[PDB]
Amino acid sequence: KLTLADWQHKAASLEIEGRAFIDGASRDAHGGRTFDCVSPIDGRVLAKVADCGEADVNAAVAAARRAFDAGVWAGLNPRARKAVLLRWAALMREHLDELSLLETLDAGKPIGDTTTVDVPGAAYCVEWFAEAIDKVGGEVAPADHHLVGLVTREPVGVVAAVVPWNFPILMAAWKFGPALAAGNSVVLKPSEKSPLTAIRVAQLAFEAGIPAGVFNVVPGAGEPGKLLALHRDVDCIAFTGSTAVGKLIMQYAAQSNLKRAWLELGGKSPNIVLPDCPDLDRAAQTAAGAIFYNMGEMCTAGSRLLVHRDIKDAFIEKLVAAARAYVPGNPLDPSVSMGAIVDGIQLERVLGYIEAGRGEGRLVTGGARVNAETGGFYVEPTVFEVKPDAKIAREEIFGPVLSVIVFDDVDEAVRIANDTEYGLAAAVWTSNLTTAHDVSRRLRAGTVWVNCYDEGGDMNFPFGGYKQSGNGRDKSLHALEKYTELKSTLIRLR
Amino acid sequence: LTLADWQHKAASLEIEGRAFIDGASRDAHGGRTFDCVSPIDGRVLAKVADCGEADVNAAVAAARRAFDAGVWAGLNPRARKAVLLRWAALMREHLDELSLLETLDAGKPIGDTTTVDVPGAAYCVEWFAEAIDKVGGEVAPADHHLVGLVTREPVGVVAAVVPWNFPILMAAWKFGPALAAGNSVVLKPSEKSPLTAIRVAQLAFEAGIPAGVFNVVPGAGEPGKLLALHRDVDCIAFTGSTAVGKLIMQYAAQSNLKRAWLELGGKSPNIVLPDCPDLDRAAQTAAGAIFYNMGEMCTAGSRLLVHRDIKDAFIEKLVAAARAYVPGNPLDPSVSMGAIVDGIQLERVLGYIEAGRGEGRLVTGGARVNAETGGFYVEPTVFEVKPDAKIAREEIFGPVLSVIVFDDVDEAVRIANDTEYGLAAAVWTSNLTTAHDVSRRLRAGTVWVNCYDEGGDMNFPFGGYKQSGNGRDKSLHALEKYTELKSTLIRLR
Amino acid sequence: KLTLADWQHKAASLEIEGRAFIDGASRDAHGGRTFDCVSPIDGRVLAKVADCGEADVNAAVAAARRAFDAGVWAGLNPRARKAVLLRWAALMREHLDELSLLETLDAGKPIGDTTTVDVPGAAYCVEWFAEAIDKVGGEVAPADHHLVGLVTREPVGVVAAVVPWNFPILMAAWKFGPALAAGNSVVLKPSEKSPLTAIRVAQLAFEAGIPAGVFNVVPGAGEPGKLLALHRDVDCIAFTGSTAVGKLIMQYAAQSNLKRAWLELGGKSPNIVLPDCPDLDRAAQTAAGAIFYNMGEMCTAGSRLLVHRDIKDAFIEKLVAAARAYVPGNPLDPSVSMGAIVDGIQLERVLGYIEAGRGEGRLVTGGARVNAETGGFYVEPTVFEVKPDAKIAREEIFGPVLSVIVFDDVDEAVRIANDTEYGLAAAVWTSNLTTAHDVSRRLRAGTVWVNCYDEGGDMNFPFGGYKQSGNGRDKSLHALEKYTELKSTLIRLR
Amino acid sequence: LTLADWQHKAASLEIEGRAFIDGASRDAHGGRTFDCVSPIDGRVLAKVADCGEADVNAAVAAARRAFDAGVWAGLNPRARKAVLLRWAALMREHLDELSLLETLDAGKPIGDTTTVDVPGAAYCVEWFAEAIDKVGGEVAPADHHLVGLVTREPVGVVAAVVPWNFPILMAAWKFGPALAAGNSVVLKPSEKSPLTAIRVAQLAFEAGIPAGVFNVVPGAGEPGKLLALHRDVDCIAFTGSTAVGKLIMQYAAQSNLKRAWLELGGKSPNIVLPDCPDLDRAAQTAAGAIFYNMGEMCTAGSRLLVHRDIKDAFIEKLVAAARAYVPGNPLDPSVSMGAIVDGIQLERVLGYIEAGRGEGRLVTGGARVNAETGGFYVEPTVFEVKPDAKIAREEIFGPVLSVIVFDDVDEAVRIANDTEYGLAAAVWTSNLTTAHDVSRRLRAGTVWVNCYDEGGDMNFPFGGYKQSGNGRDKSLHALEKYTELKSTLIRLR
């Protein structure tokens, strides 16, 4: 483990690449356009980064189209594509310190987190899809004997991925890992709030043997994301972000060329703690992690803690104690568990919910902006006790603000849990076999954790929304359906 | 049964035109109806409930109530299987009635409705019913401190908006899997073909599909748009034109992000090479591929790509094959070519025929016939054209073939794939490597080799690449449109 | 519902078919061999049944081999085979009273059981496999692109099935249902102790449209089973029965022509009851049913009840109370829950084990032969408290004799459970989520029941042995692997 | 590397002869050894542990203890994957050493062991390790009061007895999947090829496979018998002759009913039809099918069935293609056919060649060569025979081809299937229907079309119909041999 001083010294010597990566090479944006890539830690300008517009999106899409239709990557045998993707992941791992530091500088995420969750998660995602390429195939149908009936999957062609700033490298890889394994060309549009790791891994991709045009990164703001959703030559768009943008993406997809559109959106995920919870200390610590990890900037954040009246007093005590480890600090410091909020606008939005919370609920802990003098954006881990219809209980805050909701019986907790337009995740804590399975079946969410929350990172578990928390799944073999088409081939022999 | 027999049965038929909502035949709220007109002769068959906002809301509310009570979703897999099999068995018991309704309503030959449409609907239901208790979820190879499950659950309330070219068959393609998975369904059949949907809704209730769980709301574009926009619908499945599909996707997105699954148009290429195994079967099948169901088929083999070396002899054979498709009364069991659905649709087809006269070579057909009947009939029509011709590019949805010559396989594949459609394609060749190589290169959901529109097997997912739709009907893959995946991570220690 | 009197009037009027069914028609055995088919209810001779030997076995195998190699059944399309199988199952249901009565008379099984479990189960098995035929397929391998790689399953050819007398029609169907669905021809050799339902369903099969030679039934004792295991033209033998006979079958299979051999053998299945069991009363009732259902003539009988010391006394009281429902009685009486032991030799074997129990443990209830004046064979439901090492606790009895073993902790109960050469099934009763999953994972047995025992009869669950309780599985899609071969076809395009 | 380089490596090579049991290299009971003799020139390479009952027992006990302690089975899937990947990477690091051991021990051309055997071993290990965290069990579509799981668990202690024609490769085909699934393995390699098995066991331990999880017990038939009869082995996987396999099954039956999975001999037909796309490739591949690895291949294309119309010409191309397999020193990288494993095997092959002279027509080869080297070599040999010839019926396990004429495709299929074997088959044809219809009709585990022994892809289950074995090596299907199914029915209410 490197020390704070070690990370600070590396940050001082770090050469940061800000150019787009398009068709096998770094490029400035057309006409010399840039934006300032600012660090949430302290407001320092890290780099000028390409600000792409239509000329650049069009160049990226054309190169992707050219490379797909030429079969430079789709036409490789399964084992050969697996070998390239493994090499890229190995490279990510070889450059883990650099990539981790870029992520922590760019997005304010603790270095203890980026070195262990974000960069290894990205590399694992790429490796797992690489390793799956040559293990699973299509079907020979049980059809009439005069036919040879085959059902196969083929890459869709050109895939656009627009990803958010809360997990820049990790969400990026959840898109490009499966899309590339399937043989697609990819145009990735990282958030203007976190372009750097995307850019960096693009360079490593080409170094590993991903052909020119197969993996392109187009930094910029809203416009290049629009243009990719509208593009006549993009076959699929995969987005993780907010709902207004998500609803916009689906609309331009349909209105243009009916490109496949796949969204992973926000949540107001409920975390239900029952009296027979096997370990109330682990549950309280995990309830804190569920909402304060990555500064609450987690679509699956456990932002509604539903707790049974019988254990509520003791549980809230343990929660408050747990919240202490998440006092904000410099994310370059490896001992820090809560880093910086991504920018002032996000900070202000979070403080606005904290203000609503003060009026409608009981403040249990936290609630203040801190370290304003650093030039960065920091807010204490904050807990309120509220009714389930409170503003902060209903609306996604995307910050370290927990809504604690009391209930008297399990069916009530289930009713409150499901009373939302969101459906990304849920959890229940209970020692009882029947309760565990019965409640887990009834929670209307894509991921249900039992006696855990945000547990591990296993690629076998598809991840995504019911209702308005997105369509389709990331992770697992089911992720590949978003980036392939089915084909039935009926071969008549006589 | 003879033509006279079917006319007699038609005269004796008591036709139900009301909606079927929440266990009951109901007029539209406020009592409005539209006239259901037969394309055979323009005769009014029935006055059909012309449903609007209040009806849509009542159907959706009952579907929601039923789903939440678990009257259907809460039945064991074998118990839902039994009810669905009983419903298909009632369909088969009522096969003459259903087949006659479909022929009267949509102008489809009784020789087809009795053998393709109605049995095809039953089969779909029966196949999904039989699959319910055969396939499950996953136990993940997860770390040992976890029990990791991956399961599928019904989405809840499913709306299904279906077209008039195969009314009962396409309806079943939606409701068979959606109901097997446990969802409540609200079906909005085309205003051009409401009758069989209404009749199966009554049979559904009779078989034991609980009130609320299967509803039919007749009417035109408005209730379909309202279902697409509805706050309490979870999923909408649509089959129709690409242009209307685009609106459906926008309605879903704008409202509640309901899942939207479309099956859309096509301009499917049917490629015939010199080493085709049997040129006479190929020619007969090529005609069937564009004249079956009056060419009102999304997968119609509407571009016949033929190699220059066999083109002359092939066209001669095709013209001979066209003779079987003389327009006639679809109540006649010897008729293969029935009526176009209405006069607006007929005029669209005749506008494309007129376009083709101007840009290519008329080979055979091209005329509207038998106008004196009050019905809508057009000859089986063949043009030779270049691939950039309007009739070669645009979906006609009538019995109009574009014959396009090519010089080598690579050119055939380029021409085949140079379209925004992607529903189906075919190639005819005796060569092993050619059959597999070409079939891989064709960008379409279904590729037929040495066949076209072959059988109806439920194991083959069916749907679009590109602008011909997203997702698949038929096959276990159809169930994915009507369920959500859930990952359950149970931590033991 | 038919009364005892109705079943009696029906039995007096019944015309019982005793001929073999070979190559599409009933046949006497070569040279007019028969045995007397005796009823265990009262020793009445029911019918004279063909006693097949070498000429009959060879006729049946030759007809099966002809029909398979001609493709009369294997060459039908999936849907066509499905319809025929479904029709046969429908005929079984149309004749449910007849087949249920045959079974009750032939093997002494309660009519309330044969009408509700045995015959519906046989029909459901056939139906489930018929329905599965056109739903699952082979593979298109993710192979190098110059190949089309297919992985398919093909019927093995001629399948011999040798089945026991404890569940005559049900175990027969568990073999023939999947074997026939896959397209094989079958030569079924039912127990000399229970030939009649097998014979009857062969006629129904032919009426349904199963072609001549595709389903054959050859009644007789051990000789035709020996011949089938040794036959040079049989490709597969599936057996259910005793271990020593299974060992003979496996040896004869190997030495003759390496025909596939698949065995379902006996058990000494442990049923573990912990203090946090959700419902001690249901646990006790189900423990009684686990050992007294079908006279304990059940390979999966819950014949070792492991109970925690803290609840042992209370549990044993409830067990004795539950045992009262299984007083032996006339199986033709629909109110009877436990019928006759199959024959005197079996009865004396069970009484021998009971004497052994008296020598090494404590008799809790039962213990005695009853109703000897009937000419039938009956023994009370019997319970002993014994040490885990006891003779009755180690060896399979195949009668209504329960070994109750105390334990002091869950690890001990797992060690006792697994300390056997058997591994057919096990069960644990606990309300705790972790215990349930942890214990069910550690139990070395093919079926594990949690908070139930011998629960329902769902076809999705493979059923069979670890260790010496057999190889391979009956029920589920996995049962098809016993009757098919894999083929990889590698098609090189260039 | 050149001939000289391999020569220098061999002279310097240190060869380990001890057993590897319970994480240590150990002498056999009583210090007993046997001499490991190279078939290249008859030089003694090493004295190798000659294991008996005490050693078999120490290995099985160590495997049992490790399995019970869960030092390997209780690791998470990703953790087992990591160790197995490390081991395969160590094999590849040590490729030169391992290839040279295989060549010296079993006489296999160094050009083969370096490109096929050692990389195939590593790839098999890799592929199964990469698979362990991708595929899982089932959540059954059961009644709702139940949670029904269907999982797979490791069987426990797996014994593996493998032959001498592909020592490291067939060892790996067993231990790759068996270890991936969590089992402990006791490997008993052939007394004619102990060396790579021993070395890979050391490397396994190096890479982190725990003590007692992977053991190697060198020696002859007795230890293999002892493993098949062992009271505490749960499964035995055997590859070898059909006759010894029958014994393995009986040993399993008589003892503890352990699972027995056999990969046995063959007499595989290779059918060449007149419309073969490329007769020159087919002729050269036909030669490779029988002459590769000295014909010491269970899947050897040892019956070449050729249509009468192309027979003379095809035979002429076969004869040319044979010249490439002139026996040479296996340490020479330009050599394509090496040495027969020992004198007794050579005499067996020669006995068959003499049989052929009596019942057919000797086309080429026929002779023992290079006797002066002290090694065992025989020429690539071809006979024309009727299908009832002794050499056409019986497995020879040497470079001896039986060429059989046929007059039509039905006859070729009859002749191909008229054997008690069923390991593999092939057909060459350019016709789509012929290719699919013949491939379906051939009763063998692997059917090649327009190729033979094509690549080594791990996705294709390999193994016998009839008397060529039960079960399959390679693919996810290989795992079934080393796991049990469990149904867990969890009743909630």
**Contact partners, residue A339, CB within 8 Å, separation at least 6:** A40, A41, A104, A108, A109, A110, A113, A294, A295, A328, A329, A331
Judged by a CB distance cut-off of 8 A, whether residue D140 touches chain B is yes
Burial of A197 (0-12, 13-18, 19+ CB in 10 A): buried
Rounded to a whole number of angstroms, the CA Rg of chain D reads 23
- In whole angstroms, give the CA distance from residue C394 to residue D42: 56
Query: With respect to CATH, is domain C267-458 assigned 3.40.309.10?
Result: yes
- In whole angstroms, give the CA distance from residue B94 to residue B92: 5
Give the experimental resolution in Å: 1.9
Most A CBs within 10 Å, among C135, C433, C488, to test the A interface: C433
Fold for the domain defined by C1-266: Aldehyde Dehydrogenase; Chain A, domain 1 (3.40.605)
Min Cα distance A433 → chain D (Å) is 8
Decide: helix, strand or coil at residue B325: helix
Tell me which amino acid residue D483 is: T
Judged by a CB distance cut-off of 8 A, whether residue B131 touches chain D is no
CA distances from A63 to A183, A186, A262 (A): 15, 10, 23
**Contact partners, residue D17, CB within 8 Å, separation at least 6:** D33, D36, D46, D47, D48, D49, D194, D198, D218
Nearest to D155 by CA among D491, D482, D444: D482
Q: Judge whether D449 and C490 are in contact, CB under 8 Å.
A: yes
Min Cα distance D440 → chain C (Å) is 9
> What stretch of H or E contains A59?
helix A54-70
Q: Which residue has the tokens 């075919």?
A: B426
Judged by a CB distance cut-off of 8 A, whether residue C140 touches chain D is no
- In whole angstroms, give the CA distance from residue C79 to residue C89: 15
- In whole angstroms, give the CA distance from residue B158 to residue B162: 13
Chain B partners within 8 Å of C433 (Cβ): 490, 492
Judged by a CB distance cut-off of 8 A, whether residue B485 touches chain A is yes
- In whole angstroms, give the CA distance from residue A252 to residue A393: 32
Specify the DSSP class assigned to residue A384. Answer: E
Q: Give chains near B: 3+ CB pairs under 8 A.
A: A, C, D
Active-site residue, from B102, B191, B263, B480: B263
**End-to-end Cα separation, chain A, in angstroms:** 68
**Contact partners, residue C486, CB within 8 Å, separation at least 6:** C151, C152, C153, D445, D461, D463, D472, D477
The experimental method, as deposited, was: X-ray
**End-to-end Cα separation, chain D, in angstroms:** 70
Chain D partners within 8 Å of A137 (Cβ): 459
Chain A partners within 8 Å of C140 (Cβ): 137-140, 150-152
CA distances from B332 to B97, B106, B338, B376, C100 (A): 15, 14, 9, 16, 51
Closest residue, chain C, to B76 (C-alpha): C458
Subunit contact B467:A141, Cβ cutoff 8 A: no
- In whole angstroms, give the CA distance from residue C135 to residue A461: 26
Specify the DSSP class assigned to residue A114. Answer: I
Closest residue, chain A, to C182 (C-alpha): A142
- In whole angstroms, give the CA distance from residue A284 to residue A307: 11
Number of neighbouring beta carbons within 10 Å of residue C124? 20
Burial of A5 (0-12, 13-18, 19+ CB in 10 A): exposed
Chain A partners within 8 Å of D492 (Cβ): 433-434, 437-438
Active-site residue, from D263, D296, D379, D384: D263
Which among A140, A142, A436 is the nearest to C134, CB-wise?
A142
**Contact partners, residue D45, CB within 8 Å, separation at least 6:** D15, D36, D37, D38, D104, D105, D195
**Contact partners, residue A388, CB within 8 Å, separation at least 6:** A304, A405, A416, A419
Nearest to A101 by CA among A18, A194, A171, A7: A7
**Contact partners, residue B79, CB within 8 Å, separation at least 6:** none
CA distances from C268 to C293, C399, C427, C445, C464 (A): 15, 12, 12, 10, 13
Q: Judge whether C318 and C280 are in contact, CB under 8 Å.
A: yes
Which among D140, D253, D467 is the nearest to C250, CB-wise?
D253
Specify the DSSP class assigned to residue B114. Answer: I
Q: Judge whether B267 and B393 are in contact, CB under 8 Å.
A: yes
Q: Judge whether C146 and C196 are in contact, CB under 8 Å.
A: no
Number of neighbouring beta carbons within 10 Å of residue A336? 20
Subunit contact B431:D431, Cβ cutoff 8 A: yes
Specify the DSSP class assigned to residue B52. Answer: -
Closest residue, chain A, to C80 (C-alpha): A144
Subunit contact D457:C141, Cβ cutoff 8 A: yes
Subunit contact A433:D492, Cβ cutoff 8 A: yes
Most A CBs within 10 Å, among D80, D125, D127, D130, to test the A interface: D130
Judged by a CB distance cut-off of 8 A, whether residue B288 touches chain D is no
- In whole angstroms, give the CA distance from residue D266 to residue D297: 9
- In whole angstroms, give the CA distance from residue B470 to residue A237: 13
Q: For chain A, which residues make up each domain, given as ranges?
A: 1-266, 267-458
Give a three-class secondary structure readout of chain C.
Answer: CCCHHHHHHHHHHCCCCCCEEECCEEECCCCCCEEEEECCCCCCEEEEEECCCHHHHHHHHHHHHHHHHHCCCCCCCHHHHHHHHHHHHHHHHHCHHHHHHHHHHHHCCCHHHHHHHHHHHHHHHHHHHHHHCCCCCEEECCCCCCEEEEEEEEECCEEEEECCCCCHHHHHHHHHHHHHHCCCEEEEECCCCCCHHHHHHHHHHHHHCCCCCCEEECCCCHHHHHHHHHCCCCCEEEEECCHHHHHHHHHHHHHHCCCEEEEECCCCCEEEECCCCCCHHHHHHHHHHHHHHHHHCCCCCCCEEEEEHHHHHHHHHHHHHHHHHHCCCCCCCCCCCCCCCCCHHHHHHHHHHHHHHHHHCEEEECCCEECHHHCCCEECCEEEECCCCCHHHHCCCCCCEEEEEEECCHHHHHHHHHCCCCCCEEEEECCEHHHHHHHHHHCCCCEEEECCCCCCCCCCCCECCCHHHECCCECCHHHHHHCEEEEEEEEECC
- In whole angstroms, give the CA distance from residue A174 to residue A185: 15
D471 sits in the region (left: phi over 0; alpha: psi -120 to 50; else beta) called: left
Q: Give chains near D: 3+ CB pairs under 8 A.
A: A, B, C
**End-to-end Cα separation, chain C, in angstroms:** 69
- In whole angstroms, give the CA distance from residue D34 to residue D37: 9
- B266-457 to CATH, choices 1.10.3470.10, 2.40.160.210, 2.40.128.30, 3.40.309.10: 3.40.309.10
- In whole angstroms, give the CA distance from residue B438 to residue C333: 69
Which among D153, D460, D488 is the nearest to C151, CB-wise?
D460
> What stretch of H or E contains B101?
helix B95-106
Q: Judge whether B40 and B207 are in contact, CB under 8 Å.
A: no
Q: Which residues pair with A160 in a beta bridge?
A: A187, A237
Judged by a CB distance cut-off of 8 A, whether residue A70 touches chain D is no
Decide: helix, strand or coil at residue B313: helix
Q: In chain C, positions 404-423, which contact chain D (CB-CB < 8 Å)?
A: 421
Beta strand pairing status for C378-379 and C369-370? antiparallel
- Measured in degrees and rounded to the nearest 5, phi and psi for residue D175 equal -75, -25
- In whole angstroms, give the CA distance from residue C470 to residue C445: 11
Which among C243, C461, C490 is the nearest to D489, CB-wise?
C461
> What stretch of H or E contains B203?
helix B195-207
Q: Residue C354 CA to chain centroid, in angstroms?
A: 24
Active-site residue, from A98, A264, A385, A481: A264
- In whole angstroms, give the CA distance from residue A185 to residue B186: 39
Burial of C166 (0-12, 13-18, 19+ CB in 10 A): buried
Q: Judge whether D202 and D94 are in contact, CB under 8 Å.
A: no
Four-CA torsion A63, A65, A69, A71, nearest 10 degrees: 50
Active site residue A264: yes
- In whole angstroms, give the CA distance from residue C423 to residue C427: 12
Q: Judge whether A147 and A199 are in contact, CB under 8 Å.
A: no
Burial of B312 (0-12, 13-18, 19+ CB in 10 A): exposed
Q: Which residue has the tokens 């213990």?
A: C367
- B1-265 to CATH, choices 3.40.605.10, 3.30.70.260, 3.65.10.10, 3.10.20.340: 3.40.605.10
- In whole angstroms, give the CA distance from residue B109 to residue C244: 66
Q: Judge whether B398 and B295 are in contact, CB under 8 Å.
A: yes
- In whole angstroms, give the CA distance from residue D141 to residue B129: 13
Specify the DSSP class assigned to residue B268. Answer: -
